[PDB]
Amino acid sequence: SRTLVLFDIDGTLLKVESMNRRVLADALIEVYGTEGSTDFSGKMDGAIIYEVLSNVGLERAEIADKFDKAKETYIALFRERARREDITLLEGVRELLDALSSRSDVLLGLLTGNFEASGRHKLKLPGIDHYFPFGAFADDALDRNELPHIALERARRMTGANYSPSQIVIIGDTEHDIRCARELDARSIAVATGNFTMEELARHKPGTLFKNFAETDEVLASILT
Ligand SMILES: [Cl-]
Numbered sequence: 442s443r444t445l446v447l448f449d450i451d452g453t454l455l456k457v458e459s460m461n462r463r464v465l466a467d468a469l470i471e472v473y474g475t476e477g478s479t480d481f482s483g484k485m486d487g488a489i490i491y492e493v494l495s496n497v498g499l500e501r502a503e504i505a506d507k508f509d510k511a512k513e514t515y516i517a518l519f520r521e522r523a524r525r526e527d528i529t530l531l532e533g534v535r536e537l538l539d540a541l542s543s544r545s546d547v548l549l550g551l552l553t554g555n556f557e558a559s560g561r562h563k564l565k566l567p568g569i570d571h572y573f574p575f576g577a578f579a580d581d582a583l584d585r586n587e588l589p590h591i592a593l594e595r596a597r598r599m600t601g602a603n604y605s606p607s608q609i610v611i612i613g614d615t616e617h618d619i620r621c622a623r624e625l626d627a628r629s630i631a632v633a634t635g636n637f638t639m640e641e642l643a644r645h646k647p648g649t650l651f652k653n654f655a656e657t658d659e660v661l662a663s664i665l666t
């Protein structure tokens with residue numbers, strides 16, 4: 442009965458203006474001297490830092506040495522520059538989150554490639570951060586496939602619920618979302634509101650596939666059942 446529902450942010454709940462890419466580039470120039478070189482849909486913020494820097498010849502150990510400062514600089518710069526007008530809430534998202542959060546049998550959480558501080562700043566601008574009491578984030582791993590385990594442990598410690606696979610729902614817009622759900626044999630719901638079409642997403646065998654979340658009642662039925 443009790444259901445755990447985990448949402449990706451970018452291309453699932455909202456989108457951000459191209460300034461996001463430039464905030465990162467600026468933070469890396471500040472810390473390492475280079476923005477690297479330089480799609481990152483569904484990827485972990487930490488893995489993106491390693492990739493773009495390693496592309497220009499930096500060793501992993503060299504990247505690691507200043508990684509935390511690069512992270513902090515990126516977060517601070519994002520919080521400084523981003524405005525509400527940079528964020529676009531996707532179709533039906535607020536309606537869906539209201540429908541879920543009003544149910545006692547539902548626990549909502551985030552499972553995202555964003556660092557928590559910047560991912561939650563994105564959610565705060567349009568005023569949907571308040572729906573998400575916990576999550577797993579890029580602070581927790583470089584590999585998205587470690588996150589479901591971490592989120593499951595956190596949810597269980599919060600509620601005392603021992604969610605079974607059919608009680609866990611992982612929602613996102615890329616193959617990486619679908620793939621990380623397999624870690625828990627969870628129910629994956631993919632939504633084709635990012636850079637990948639239904640035809641593309643369908644090859645990864647999501648449990649369910651939506652075009653978008655316009656029909657709140659049907660998305661809810663699909664999530665709870
Ligand atoms: Cl909020």
Ligand SMILES: [Mg+2]
Binds near residue numbers: 452483613
């Ligand atoms: Mg996404």
Ligand SMILES: [Mg+2]
Binds near residue numbers: 499500
């Ligand atoms: Mg080398």
